[PDB]
Amino acid sequence: PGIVELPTLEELKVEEVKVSSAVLKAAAHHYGAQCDKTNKEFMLCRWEEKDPRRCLK
Amino acid sequence: DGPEKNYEKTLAILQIESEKAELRLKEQEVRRLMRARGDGPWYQFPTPEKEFIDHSPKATPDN
């Protein structure tokens, strides 16, 4: 069939959070309260468009 | 009663039997066509039920 179209490493490049899981769990509730809208937008786009390449932004 | 009674009774019987023969041949052709390419009421083989599929959002988004 047709070939699969997936983005390149430059499109997948981002400033990752080099933060440990204990740090994340310590800041978990306030991160879920303050950054809620962007996270819910990303989850909505992921559960509507099943393709992960449509939600890189 | 006379010969016309038997004559016309024989005509009615022959019409009935000829119609029955044509109907039986047509039924054989219908059954053969439906079994070959099932698109009529008959020979409709089953299929898993559509209503027992989850469409609710799930844990993994890639569904």
Instruction: Give me the resolution in angstroms, 1 decimal.
Output: 2.9
CA A30 – CA A33 distance, rounded (Å):
5
DSSP A2-57: PPP----TTTS--------HHHHHHTHHHHHHHSHHHHHHHHHHHHHS--GGG---
| Closest chain B residue to A45, measured at CA | B61
Tell me which chain B residues have a C-beta less than 8 angstroms from the C-beta of A43.
61
| Closest chain A residue to B61, measured at CA | A47
A54's tokens: 């449509």
Residues B12-48: b if buried by 16+ CB within 10 A, e if exposed = eeeeeeeeeeeeeeeeeeeeeeeeeeeeeeeeeeeee
Phi-psi region of B2 (alpha: psi -120 to 50; beta: other; left: phi over 0): left
CA B27 – CA B33 distance, rounded (Å):
10
Q: Is A45 exposed, middle or buried (0-12, 13-18, 19+ CB in 10 A)?
A: middle
Cβ contact B62–A52 (<8 Å): yes
Tell me which chain B residues have a C-beta less than 8 angstroms from the C-beta of A46.
61
CA A21 – CA B51 distance, rounded (Å):
42
Phi, psi (degrees; rounded to nearest 5) at A2:
-75, 155
CA distance A49 to chain B (A): 8
Cβ contact A43–B61 (<8 Å): yes
CA distance A45 to chain B (A): 10
Q: What is the dihedral of CA B42, B44, B45, B49, to 10 degrees?
A: -150
Q: Do residues B45 and B39 make contact, with C-beta atoms less than 8 angstroms apart? A: no
H or E segment to which residue B7 belongs: helix B3-36
Q: How far is CA A18 from the centre of its chain?
A: 15
CA A1 – CA A50 distance, rounded (Å):
20
CA B26 – CA B14 distance, rounded (Å):
18
Whether A50 contacts chain B with CB within 8 A: yes
CA B13 – CA B21 distance, rounded (Å):
12
A30's tokens: 């306030």
